[model samples]
Target: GEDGYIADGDNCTYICTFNNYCHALCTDKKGDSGACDWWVPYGVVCWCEDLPTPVPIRGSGKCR
Candidate 1:
């Protein structure tokens, strides 16, 4: 089980409005499921489970 920001640390409260988008985000990364869940420090975030050992870097400051 694992979790991370859906949009590179963006809040899921906003991003998860579109449920399918969240599902796509996680499934693409090899996650079994995706949903908005409460996290201790980040509040609500896109949670993913059954992902690869090393999750990909979802964000970088530079636009590329």
Candidate 2:
């Protein structure tokens, strides 16, 4: 997690249903059977697993 964002610790929990935009990323990371449900979006990258698909950002900041 980021230093001062919603999640700042090594682990946390996030909720997402199958229709959520972040669902694929969350499920891929923890696998289809893990308990940890938080999805950490770091520099457009999810630490637990590669993004299911590329995310398009329209900024020139860190997300670029």
Candidate 3:
């Protein structure tokens, strides 16, 4: 199956909650696809073909 890209809204960003787990892969403004895995304490993980690996925001801190 083809993977889907989760929209980060106009904010171009997303924060994973402490009690919730969020996993998302995306194609930037261009168009690409890949995998991103984010676990607790580590926050949201992003994997893209054109962008750097962005450590998604976790509440107010970067995944640690």
Query: What C-alpha RMSD separates each model from the true structure?
Result: 5.7, 10.9, 9.1
List of clashing residue pairs for candidate 3: none
lDDT of 1 by residue, 1-64 (tens): 4555544433223234555666777888788877665542444556665656556423544323
The lDDT per prediction is 0.55, 0.30, 0.36
**Candidate 1: worst 10 consecutive residues by lDDT?**
6-15
Candidate 1: TM-score? 0.50
Tell me each candidate's TM-score. 0.50, 0.20, 0.27
Per-residue lDDT for 1-64 in model 2, tens only?
1111112123332344333434454454432322223443532322223222232212223421
Ranking by lDDT: 1, 3, 2
Using TM-score as the measure, name the better of candidate 2 and candidate 3. Answer: 3
Q: Which residue runs does candidate 1 get wrong by more than 4 Å? A: 1-15, 38-40, 56-64
lDDT of 2 at 59: 26
Clashes of 3: 0
lDDT of 2: 0.30
Instruction: Give the runs in model 3 whose Cα sits over 4 Å from its true position.
Output: 1-25, 40-42, 52-64
TM-score of 2: 0.20
